């Protein structure tokens, strides 16, 4: 996770941000430059680019049994596997503290059938969601959420959200409700031994305070606003026990009507992200916290399109599967002491560095919510044989693996190493996309007859829309060539010259129009079919990216016709007709950022945060740091080869 | 910085001055003997050339955390390549600490061992600048700032000042107001193990008063002046404790009413100087104070406009970003103990060199505001070059980036190597004028309109105007040719004469109409192109300087008119009448500086003080000293090269 | 410690002394002589020489949180560093002794948070320095202390002292005071294992009667004289326990009010050292032992000045740092068994020194007070680049670390090495006299206008004046060339001669006017500047030691001409004008130590004490002894290197 968002700045130090919303949405601006070169001339052209986001969202989030990881429990107790050393457990009762040999034979006859079942990815998911909804209700910018209009001259659509941003609360309060539901049977537990099969959770460390939050968060969890990170869970467990120095009574007293809402309200973020830190440290859940943080990041947000074409893709919600609550650290008092075992070298490199810098979970949920797009979209296209020199079926392989089918859209067009969960049957996926002809029904203010599709004042839109912008990422190139994507290019020569214009390849064309408008100039074309919106390669002021064409996702349509080239309103370096014989001249174009920021409403600026990779560097100490571990439980990340994108271990 | 202002150790020598000024404004004066070469015979002439410059100044600085840093710690913690040993530390406090086993460090990291954001680079431009405030203070001088209003005989101008100068104050005062604001939460700590993840700095060595004074410039800061170092600032930290073997309250019980405000007035400049360069030595921040002083020092004073079309300039007020105040030295005393580790070899000259030598900065600051403000209006040229470069081969590109942005104009304008800041994300630019193109209007009066081409009261004027002369920075080295900026230059006449002879090269023209001016005739020019009025060469008194006009730089014209040139009302030396043939002769213009100093107000003068070398050559004794360093954490200096110009590390 | 005194003497017998008197002072005698050598021609001068000190002062002493020294505990129950064998010493419980497993395991429980701080250096540093107070009131020399009035002729100066030595205690009693003060929570302990977290001391090997007394230092400790080692502590401890074989209560009833104040009387010095050294022997504390001796000597002490200048040391008091009472050794029974681990081998060289001769302390502490004020005062003067081949600023330099700034001080004017106190935010300092301009007033009754500053009736004095004469310590040599401080050098030909006199070098002019004054002839001078108080080398009988001049510690001024050098009144041996061409002849002056002792008061003479290394040496049966100690805990003396004075590992 870590080495994939500092790998997207080409290791050249990486500029991350904070959360920050207004009313759901935000948008990050880059200073960014254009070369034109021709005959030693070389013409730079500077401009603002810029691209929104919104937090807003409707996770469908499903709650189903998972695997058991005991990955971080002591050496001494636990098999040369994940499996639970018993035996060793109970010797330890009657060797190490005060216990009959008859008191432990009792105890290990009444736990026989026992199942040890530890997951907190759920708890987790909880606690670290919690702080990213106090961080905003401590900026001011915690609202109900809501979605940005798309009206541009010919239509307007505006997504419809089930909660009123205006009415409600700009407070984030306790997610489980008072008086409407009921709690969790919870109790402060020191004994030697468990003597129930109920989750037995390990917070001695903690603070009374952060204890509180952690039954909070234990607790039911109401979806109170529209963000997507803000998804309506059950309690984790009905009832559970909490080993700790002392009983606690704080949160309890709120529940019986005693404590005012007032004299009990949500701590701090920083006590917030202090309990999750100590809870994480104690009980080393490393590795599942790194599941959690994992799956949070991929729904976390989605790029806001400037075209009603893009806006299919906050139509649709993402399902994710998330693992029941277990825990059985909080079992014994000697569980989580020794060393920890089996705790991997990535989960620990991402973790500390979470840890010191939260902000890397919500800037890399950014890049992930554009390369994910981005990568999907590519996927249509790169399966038409457009610019892929390596020919397979993107539309059955890696999406048809719900752990995998995030990451292949990544490395699909980032061309990086997307990097798995680190479980099983834990996702984030949209199933009902993995349909080319997928479908959507988007509702829209016909305003004009320019053309898009019409039934019923909603437009239909195929697969993923072109959406964000290649800028949060702008190293990115989903090809093989040099493209727009890529850091630069050269046009070269129309392979055919005729009196009206020139033929061009599929690529070949857009490689020009993009680079071909940004330098202040209208490419128009016709092709030899129909299923073109329009004439005229689309871009939009903003980002200024020409979006690549549309008829050439479908096949067997391999060269494009490009006529009349007119410089456009505002023009900036003059060129070459370039579709002509004579007027040609091969220009290499290269766009490089000098400056990116973010912004959210009309007066948060925000300047991108550094961070020293040499100072972050995790503790090894009383840890059992383990740099290998098998695809079944899914580590390792996936990427695009010579033979096609597929997964491989982390090493 | 050192390196910068002595011309990396030239005849090896230097003579620098002290702040001193008359209401927020001082002048440079020298006394210099232009030679006139020609018949085989020099004449010459000597005089009096000064340039005022106004401390005066509104700077909008902000604050954000930037990137930790981590130099002022032993060598057995950090490595270069090996970065932070964390574990290394938490292995040193089981053996010091009532703490059993291996709970120690896991309890150690939970609190504070993931944060150790580290960074002084607020708190020592809080000492720093506030000594320069106590020593106009000490000199008597301690006054508001006014920027002085020009008059030309023509248009006059008058800027507006949020805050009164002879009603104003006459000390400097604790920039903290008691009774209005509220105050950080310190308190003396010396546990072995810190118990709240919060600043913690080392101070133990720094005497009762001079550990006041920290804690007085730890405090929120409340901008009295208008001079630009008296910058509106808050508390560096809300809360936060110092390693100290007393407790300190002289400030706290000024705090109330039991200390009064007479018996706590702010300590000497010696003291406050003394304190500060205790505490940068004990911690070792080094490589932190080197881009403290470097950012006070740019943001400064300004060069006082000769000319009314340099007023523009004047009111640009540089936005600053100075990072988040995080400490990281106090937490434990065994961090500071050994060699400090990995210490730039630039900062600790410059550190070695302002501490026995405070003034350099000020002088060092004085040659970058008038070196910044010609190289910014080299820029516009260097790039069109008067419109004889087709295209963009200048490279300016590198004006894009805050940081490098100020060292760019000061390398535009001479061969220096501009000093980097030594630190990432951290800056003093003026974002107003990252087109070189870029506009700005003026208010104005109004006298007989000449070639002043306003607008309703408005001074149109673009890129940035000539403000001021080279002299402090004389042997210059602006233009590849000899000019005035050079320091000699000859006149080879007329490409062709006329009725009146009048054709020169753009440049040619403003050589000798600079050095015509000089002997005492200024030469009369025509353009048929819109002058706007313009007919002759301007010149002012203080600063005989002659600009180049913005027309000799519109691109547009390249020959000039020199229609005659007319005895001035006071006449030096003698010349014939070389605007016409059989009269011109070539003539060589050299001239030399007889002596220079510096007199603020008016009385008493200012003898610059020689600073030489090798009696500042630092001790490397106890430290590691790097020579090298990166690209990332901004270390090296942007240079001039046969394109334009482009960043390089120090190597 | 000791292998410091003992190198001083050249190893040459060390004659030392113990603690004696006269109302707060005494002086010391040496019999030296001084030979003249010219042409083969030799005389030789036998004179007395005397140095008074003073016992008292006021030390600023802060008592903070130290890190915790297990160093001294069986190697059964200690990690491989400082770290608690907890699991080892919870397992002796149950397997040694006769507790049950349930019984050790609720222990352990309840000892969880439990922090182990064990720091003794603030309870041996009273039971020493009541030791000391106590060898006063048993040879009778017991007072309230005083400062010796400093007349001469043109001025007279009585330092004001808080408490009159007249009126005041004969008699040292209990330093808590009865009735007006509250006690300590002390209870005998004798079971298994510890029950609270409060100190457990262990003095179970002591006897009733030194129980008492430890148990006396460990309560308030009240300031009665004047004396720097008797300053004002708090009761080390609210509450705690004590392990000895049986209940005690003999000191109990002295605070009931039933015990009559002399029936409870402090006990003898004998009584008192062997509760100190059966204390510090039974705890194995050794190597805090040699902090809390290092400590107590360091501030001890101060020579008084035969000049109104040099009276500006005994103004300022030292700021010692010491750390906060802890005790664990009591805690169990076995805790102090099997072997010491963790002693260093300076620590037992030094302890069984101190042991078998407490005078060492009484003797170093004299010695360290002059080598100290010399050392500090040669800081100014080595600075000047005088008679230093190595160029360093000694100024910042090592006084700025608080644990190294009085060692630095002695290694940088005896030349040796400075032996550091063994721990961490431990020392003695004078913080407001780390800057070289610091000045000083001190109160003078003017006399005459001979000539010194004056204002207001007090004189200003910057920086330390030379009080202490070099003959406690006479092979002391604070250069690196021949001169008084050394054994012998020549003084040679002026560098240049003339008409009224010669002028020499900084240093040659002080070398010969040293031995000028010695062979009874006063030199006269006259230097290029003016801040000399006056002219005529100054230099006072008693120990009749030619002061450094003044003006040479003020640089640039690398050159003195002497003139006029007129035979004194009391003539020794004739002598070459010497700064005549003719009449001069190269003399090489030899001064050694014949005879040295001590005398307090007008009858107290006492001889030096011998003592013997070969029988002195120290017992490692059962320790641990470690030849090896890191530097952060500050094992290790400083020394002055090629390279400059810096720290350097004890090996």
């Known amino acids: 996770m870590l080495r994939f968002v500092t790998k997207n700045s080409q290791d050249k130090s990486s500029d991350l941000f904070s959360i920050c919303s207004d009313r759901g949405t935000f948008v990050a601006h880059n200073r960014v430059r254009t070369d034109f070169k021709f005959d030693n001339l070389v013409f730079n052209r500077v401009y603002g680019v ?9 996770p469908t989030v499903c709650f189903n049994e998972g695997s058991s990881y005991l990955e971080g429990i002591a050496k001494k107790y636990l098999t040369l596997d994940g499996g639970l050393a018993i035996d060793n457990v109970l010797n330890e009762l009657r060797s190490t503290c005060g216990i009959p040999g008859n008191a432990v034979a009792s105890h290990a006859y009444n736990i026989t059938s026992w199942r040890w079942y530890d997951n907190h990815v759920a708890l987790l998911m909880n606690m670290l969601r919690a702080y990213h909804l106090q961080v905003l209700t401590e900026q001011g910018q915690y609202s109900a959420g809501d979605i940005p209009m798309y009206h541009d001259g010919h239509v307007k ?17 306790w997610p489980s409700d008072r008086s409407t539901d009921s709690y969790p049977d919870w109790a402060q537990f020191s004994e030697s031994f468990p003597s129930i099969d109920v989750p037995y959770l390990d917070v001695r460390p903690l603070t009374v305070t952060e204890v509180n939050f952690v039954l909070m968060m234990m607790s039911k969890w109401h979806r109170r606003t ?8 059950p309690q984790l467990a009905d009832k559970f026990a909490y080993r700790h120095a002392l009983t606690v009574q704080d949160a309890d007293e709120w529940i019986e009507g005693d404590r005012t809402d ?34 949070l990041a991929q729904i976390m947000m989605k790029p806001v399109p400037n075209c009603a074409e893009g806006y299919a893709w906050l139509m649709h919600d993402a399902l994710v599967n998330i693992p029941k609550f277990g825990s059985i650290r909080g079992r014994y008092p000697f569980l989580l002491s020794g060393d920890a075992a089996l705790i991997q070298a990535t989960a620990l490199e991402d973790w500390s560095a979470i840890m010191a810098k939260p902000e890397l979970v919500f800037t890399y949920a950014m890049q992930v919510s554009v390369a994910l ?47 798995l969960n680190g479980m099983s049957d834990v996702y ?35 697969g993923v829309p072109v959406a964000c912008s290649p800028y949060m990422i702008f190293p990115v190139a989903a090809f093989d060539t040099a493209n727009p994507y890529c850091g630069n290019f050269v046009i070269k020569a129309a392979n055919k010259y005729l009196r009206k214009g020139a033929v061009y390849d599929k690529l070949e064309a857009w490689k020009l129009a993009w680079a071909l408008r940004v330098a202040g100039y209208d490419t128009h074309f016709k092709v030899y079919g129909d299923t073109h919106g329009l004439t005229k390669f689309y871009a939009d002021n903003g980002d200024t990216w020409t979006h690549i064409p549309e008829f050439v996702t479908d096949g067997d349509v391999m060269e494009v016709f490009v006529t009349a080239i007119e410089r456009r309103a505002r023009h900036f370096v003059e060129l070459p007709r370039l579709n002509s014989p004579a007027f040609f001249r091969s220009v290499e174009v290269s766009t490089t950022i000098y400056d990116t920021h973010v912004q959210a409403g009309a007066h948060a600026v925000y300047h991108a945060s550094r961070i020293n990779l040499d100072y972050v560097k995790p503790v090894s100490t009383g840890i059992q740091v383990i740099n290998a571990g098998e695809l079944k439980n899914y580590w390792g990340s996936v990427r695009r080869t010579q033979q096609g994108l597929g997964v491989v271990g982390l090493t």
Do not use: W
């Not at 457009?386 to 699909?412: K, R």
């Open 50 to 58: 810029s691209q929104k986001f919104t937090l807003v969202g409707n």
């Open 262 to 295: 007032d004299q009990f309200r949500p701590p701090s973020s920083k006590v917030m992200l202090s309990a999750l830190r100590k809870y994480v440290n104690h009980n080393r859940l490393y590795n599942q916290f790194y599941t959690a943080a994992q799956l």
């Open 226 to 233: 529209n963000l997507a990170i803000d998804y309506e869970a």
């Open 157 to 173: 659509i505006k997504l419809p959200v089930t909660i009123d941003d205006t009415a409600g609360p700009t407070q984030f309060a």
């Open 428 to 462: 984030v996926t949209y199933p009902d996309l993995l349909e080319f002809d997928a479908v959507t029904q988007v509702p829209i203010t016909v305003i004009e007859p320019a053309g898009y599709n019409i039934v019923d004042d909603h437009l239909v839109v195929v």
């Open 373 to 419: 797009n981005t990568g999907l979209y590519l996927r249509r296209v790169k399966k038409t044989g457009f610019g892929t020199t390596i020919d397979d079926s993107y539309e059955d392989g890696a999406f048809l693996q719900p752990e995998t089918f995030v990451q292949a859209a990544l490395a699909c067009c980032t061309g990086q190493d997307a990097p």
